[PDB]
Amino acid sequence: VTNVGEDGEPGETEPRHALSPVDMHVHTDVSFLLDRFFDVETLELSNLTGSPATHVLDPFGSTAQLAWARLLNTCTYFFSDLELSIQFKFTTTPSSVGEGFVWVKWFPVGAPTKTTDAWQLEGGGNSVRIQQLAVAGMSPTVVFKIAGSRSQACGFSVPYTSMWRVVPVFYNGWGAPTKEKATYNWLPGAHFGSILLTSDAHDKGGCYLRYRFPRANMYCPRPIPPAFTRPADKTRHKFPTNINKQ
Amino acid sequence: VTNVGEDGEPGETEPRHALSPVDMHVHTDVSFLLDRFFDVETLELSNLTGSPATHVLDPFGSTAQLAWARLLNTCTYFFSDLELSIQFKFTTTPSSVGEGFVWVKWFPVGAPTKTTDAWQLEGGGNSVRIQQLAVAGMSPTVVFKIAGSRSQACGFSVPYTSMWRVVPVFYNGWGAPTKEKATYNWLPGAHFGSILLTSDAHDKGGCYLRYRFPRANMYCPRPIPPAFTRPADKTRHKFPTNINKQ
Amino acid sequence: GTTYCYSKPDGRPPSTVSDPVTRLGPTLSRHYTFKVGEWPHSQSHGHAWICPLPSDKLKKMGSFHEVVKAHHLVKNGWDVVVQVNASFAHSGALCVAAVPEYEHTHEKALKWSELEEPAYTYQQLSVFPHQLLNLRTNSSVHLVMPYIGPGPTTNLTLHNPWTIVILILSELTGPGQTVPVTMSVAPIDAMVNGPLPNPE
Amino acid sequence: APIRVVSVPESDSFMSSVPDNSTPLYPKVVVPPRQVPGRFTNFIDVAKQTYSFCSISGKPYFEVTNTSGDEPLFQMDVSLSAAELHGTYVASLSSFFAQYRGSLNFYFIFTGAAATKAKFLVAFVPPHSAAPKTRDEAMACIHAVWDVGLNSAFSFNVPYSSPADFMAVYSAEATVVNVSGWLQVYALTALTSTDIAVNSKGRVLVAVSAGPDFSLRHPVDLPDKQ
Amino acid sequence: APIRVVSVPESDSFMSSVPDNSTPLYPKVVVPPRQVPGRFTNFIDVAKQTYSFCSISGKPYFEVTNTSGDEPLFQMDVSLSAAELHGTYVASLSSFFAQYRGSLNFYFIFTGAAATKAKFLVAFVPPHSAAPKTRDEAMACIHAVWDVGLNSAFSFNVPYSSPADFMAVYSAEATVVNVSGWLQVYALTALTSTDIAVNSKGRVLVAVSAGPDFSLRHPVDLPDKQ
Amino acid sequence: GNSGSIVQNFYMQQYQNSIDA
Amino acid sequence: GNSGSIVQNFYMQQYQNSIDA
Amino acid sequence: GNSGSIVQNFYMQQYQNSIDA
Amino acid sequence: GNSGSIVQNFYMQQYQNSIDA
Amino acid sequence: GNSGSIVQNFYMQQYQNSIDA
Numbered sequence A, B: 001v002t003n004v005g006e007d008g009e010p011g012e013t014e015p016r017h018a019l020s021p022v023d024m025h026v027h028t029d030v031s032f033l034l035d036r037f038f039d040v041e042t043l044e045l046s047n048l049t050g051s052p053a054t055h056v057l058d059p060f061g062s063t064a065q066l067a068w069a070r071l072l073n074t075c076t077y078f079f080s081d082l083e084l085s086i087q088f089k090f091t092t093t094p095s096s097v098g099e100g101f102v103w104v105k106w107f108p109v110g111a112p113t114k115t116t117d118a119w120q121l122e123g124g125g126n127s128v129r130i131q132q133l134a135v136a137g138m139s140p141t142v143v144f145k146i147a148g149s150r151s152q153a154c155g156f157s158v159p160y161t162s163m164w165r166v167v168p169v170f171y172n173g174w175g176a177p178t179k180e181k182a183t184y185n186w187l188p189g190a191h192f193g194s195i196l197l198t199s200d201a202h203d204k205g206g207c208y209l210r211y212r213f214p215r216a217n218m219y220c221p222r223p224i225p226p227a228f229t230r231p232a233d234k235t236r237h238k239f240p241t242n243i244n245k246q
Numbered sequence C: 001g002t003t004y005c006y007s008k009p010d011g012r013p014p015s016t017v018s019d020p021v022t023r024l025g026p027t028l029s030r031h032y033t034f035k036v037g038e039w040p041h042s043q044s045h046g047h048a049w050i051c052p053l054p055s056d057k058l059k060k061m062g063s064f065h066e067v068v069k070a071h072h073l074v075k076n077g078w079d080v081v082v083q084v085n086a087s088f089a090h091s092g093a094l095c096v097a098a099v100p101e102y103e104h105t106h107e108k109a110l111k112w113s114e115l116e117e118p119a120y121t122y123q124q125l126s127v128f129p130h131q132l133l134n135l136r137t138n139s140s141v142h143l144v145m146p147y148i149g150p151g152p153t154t155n156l157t158l159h160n161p162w163t164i165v166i167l168i169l170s171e172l173t174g175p176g177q178t179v180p181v182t183m184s185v186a187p188i189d190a191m192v193n194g195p196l197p198n199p200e
Numbered sequence D, E: 001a002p003i004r005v006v007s008v009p010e011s012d013s014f015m016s017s018v019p020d021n022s023t024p025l026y027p028k029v030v031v032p033p034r035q036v037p038g039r040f041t042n043f044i045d046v047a048k049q050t051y052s053f054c055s056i057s058g059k060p061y062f063e064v065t066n067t068s069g070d071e072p073l074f075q076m077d078v079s080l081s082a083a084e085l086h087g088t089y090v091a092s093l094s095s096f097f098a099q100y101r102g103s104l105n106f107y108f109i110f111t112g113a114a115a116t117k118a119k120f121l122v123a124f125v126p127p128h129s130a131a132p133k134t135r136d137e138a139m140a141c142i143h144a145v146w147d148v149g150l151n152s153a154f155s156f157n158v159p160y161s162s163p164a165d166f167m168a169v170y171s172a173e174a175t176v177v178n179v180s181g182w183l184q185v186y187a188l189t190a191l192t193s194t195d196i197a198v199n200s201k202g203r204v205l206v207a208v209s210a211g212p213d214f215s216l217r218h219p220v221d222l223p224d225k226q
Numbered sequence F, G, H, I, J: 001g002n003s004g005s006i007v008q009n010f011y012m013q014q015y016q017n018s019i020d021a
């Protein structure tokens, strides 16, 4: 009612010569917010021998206060490719590992799994056994050394493997006929596939997972979790910054 | 009066067949004088654990006899992008650090700040904790190793972040409603943003800040500070040089 | 003669307010005229009258004054004319200037006052938009400054961008009396934002 | 024939935001196509074309009773890190950044029964003084009048007023780019009702959409919860 | 398929003036526009289109009294690291470099009261001999005459005379490119005044603008204060 | 979105990433 | 001003630095 | 089949591999 | 005289060396 | 004879080897 200002008048609000543009919104571009490296996870290695476990690239669980945590929670359905950096930190005296040969293998959404030592390198007694799937072949293997290695890390790009045209970050259903608990918001292969780190370290070190999700596609906006306690009435939420009264 | 020479004549000066050009002034080009690396500052690191402090890229204070000190004092308002080099020097016996993994993170004009250990890498007991914001993500992280690292330095470019279309290197006003001391020539976010260096060194080392300011834009010339004591009457100011009586 | 502070004044309306904008007709931002001070025979060089515009003296613009009272921000230039009064038997000169974010003021901010500059400054004061008042030549310095500052407009209650320096170059040499300085500020291209409430 | 190369000083450093990508190790993957509706492109779109519901003492509405006068009914420090925003979309989206910019639209939906009527002065008070405390105090400022019983819902635009080309998504001890003012709804009259024993009060929901000129910048990582 | 490369000997060295830039880690930042007046481009411009005020015994002027003759009134070793320059813009700007080049303009503004008059011989004396000590000595050289009471201000151009394609911004124990000569103002007559009990002396300000052919080169870092 | 180098296509559009229908 | 290589544009004008309006 | 770079032809088609008739 | 590569102009003719009038 | 790269001419035909008349 009445609209454009100055007259005390009922529905009549005042004028607003709305703003110009700068930045063209671009930072809030879902594809851009997601194409960078995130420190998601931290895990330890496996000994070259034993009958070890594969690890799963599932950045959909969350709960850890991390920005990329939420954001993936912001949408119902997601699709993007993957990109890694694995860094391996030291947890003892760095002079313990002279070699430090690390085997890594990537497993695509839905690959077979049981592995036991099965490859045997020998030479001058002693002789090493690497893992049955640590080996090089079909799924990409990546071997790197950490011995003065100016950056104890390795890295690469890996495609959207799932058999699902998109991934439901939420699922009002079960992924199995047996409607068991655990099988709730599940639906199998709703992730990026898996990896196996294995080495004569394993002890002496932890890892550093890092994902970069290029080509981000987000479908169906969802409620965006608060992330901070509710401040008191009629007040602000004061925080420490690059600004502030010095 | 009279002008062009030879006649004793009053206002009449003599002739001057003014000079040619060479160098086209170009060195005094504000954009060029500023696009190089300056050793501005020197600071120490922070332990991977504790509840540390961010550092502020404010090259506007000055007082230190450094050329780039003045020059930034030569103008009222400034704008340029930033560029860094961080070198980390050793302050003990270089054989103390076998690893020397250093986490750095850059914070844009006006970012949140409280950080405590929050990321935990584990593997074979011991286990490391890095900083809550040392982690990789939104603001750029840079991790480098200093272990034989042929150049113990790292480096990168960072954009003009401030919310101010330009930065007042001088401010006849306050940046807060509470006209307190400290809040004088202040006005928040009148700088480049901040950084956090953190590592299993911290002790064993200092740092080496270096800025390069590309795209320099200087508005309103200001008085240019003298930099040397006032010499005696009718004399010169003799100095040591690449010339001089040998 | 008319000297411009960096550029003629723009009547552009603030790049940073979707908020409703009242422009000030001259008849509101009228003209104001006060006495700076009495340049005396003793005041050795390097002295000066700081006139940071407009504050301190803002209570006295009694009309322009009024609208800037009940309004959050303003963008405006300044037609300003400093007028020393002296005979042809006096000697000496000053240099009066408009300075961008001038500061030293021993935080007696936005209050006009008196100081003694460091020297490298009076020597280089002229590096700003200034004019010479030479007692054997003229008796008036005239300048016009435009809105200026980090923000596309500011709060005159917290920040004064423009500030007139009235510097003493050659001491007042001549008849025993003093030479009264004076100044007429009148706002150019005034523009306000956000009316504040009622003083109750 | 070998190329002549110099190893730039940072050479073996990592850096988590490289504008470039890593080496592929599983090529030739063609992906299945997706019809799946509502793929959003940019976060500002849902924030603009979407109303969030405010936060006051825990509920998303404010009350009018058959007794009120000039006591301000709704008040908020215009800052993203303000209270009455805490619950909302816009506010929470902005946590993902450093600087915000623009006007915000408020939607008040009076929800008292049709037998009921009332009026309010929604006003915006510029960040100077020390905050008004009565209608007759705010009235001198930007405000409009809402007679519930003309529109049962109304929109009000909290403008962007600042020397600040951008503003602070992460506010704190009052700075010059920390606050843009105060939103206040006051009670113009009180609750008139067919029968005051049934309808004695009214609940006006209050929602927040993002402003058309609204924008966000400089993505940031999360500090310690607080 | 890998390229064949040889690691040039300096490979992991730093070097602080690389003609090239570092790797970006925060792209897509669009900056707000700036109207803000008086953006200078090159430092020689303000130095040319701007007068600085000289330095003599602490003050920026020299005196004439009702008693003077040939005693030289103003004298300066033409070098940037000269005394009477110490305070000024041009001089201080040049500290930022190694070599200067060209003429400099001097502005003398006589400021004695209008009841007053006087004259001077401003002269420039070439860097050979051992410096003149009386007007009748300098007169044989480049100079003009200033009758204050024709112009109350006058300009005088100290030329560039040297086998030196460039000159020394940092002078010292007398070298061939260390000095270009001597500026001297002498008193042609003395102070005539309507009434000598009131006006007995006069103050001529003396300012220095940069020469049109003036230029600077080879940016340098600051040595120990001295 | 965020891929900005020139060498970003050092590898093919086919090899590098994934491809829709 | 002082950027003089060829590889100076290895990265984009958009990514590398900042951009005015 | 699986050779996808640009530099894959850094070496010649003649030198690199084998050649049929 | 003796500069013979292709990359010899990796840097500009302006930046690399000196320039006559 | 056996020179087969592309970078084989990284250096000039004049600088690299020898030249007949």
Ligand SMILES: CC(=O)N[C@H]1[C@H]([C@H](O)[C@H](O)CO)O[C@@](O[C@H]2[C@@H](O)[C@@H](CO)O[C@@H](O[C@H]3[C@H](O)[C@@H](O)[C@@H](O)O[C@@H]3CO)[C@@H]2O)(C(=O)O)C[C@@H]1O
Binding pocket: A117, A118, A119, A120, A121
């Ligand atoms: C995938 C697989 O087959 N794994 C088997 C490994 C691999 O074949 C082996 O590591 C290839 O390098 O081999 C295993 O069996 C080997 C083991 O029994 C050793 C111990 O004597 O002998 C190996 O054969 C010898 C043979 O005895 C010699 O005559 C000579 O030919 O050399 C070979 C090997 O160099 C067996 O292949 C193993 O022990 O791990 C079985 C794994 O399942």
Ligand SMILES: CC(=O)N[C@H]1[C@H]([C@H](O)[C@H](O)CO)O[C@@](O[C@H]2[C@@H](O)[C@@H](CO)O[C@@H](O[C@H]3[C@H](O)[C@@H](O)[C@@H](O)O[C@@H]3CO)[C@@H]2O)(C(=O)O)C[C@@H]1O
Binding pocket: A041, A042, A063, A064, A065, A066, B117, B118, B119, B120, B121
């Ligand atoms: C941002 C954040 O959440 N920081 C919290 C960290 C990180 O979640 C953690 O470093 C991720 O690697 O974790 C903190 O809490 C962990 C701590 O209590 C340890 C000690 O027992 O347990 C961790 O959970 C274990 C769990 O007990 C096991 O069952 C199994 O699942 O492994 C996990 C971890 O590998 C807690 O998450 C921490 O101690 O720093 C709390 C930080 O705030």
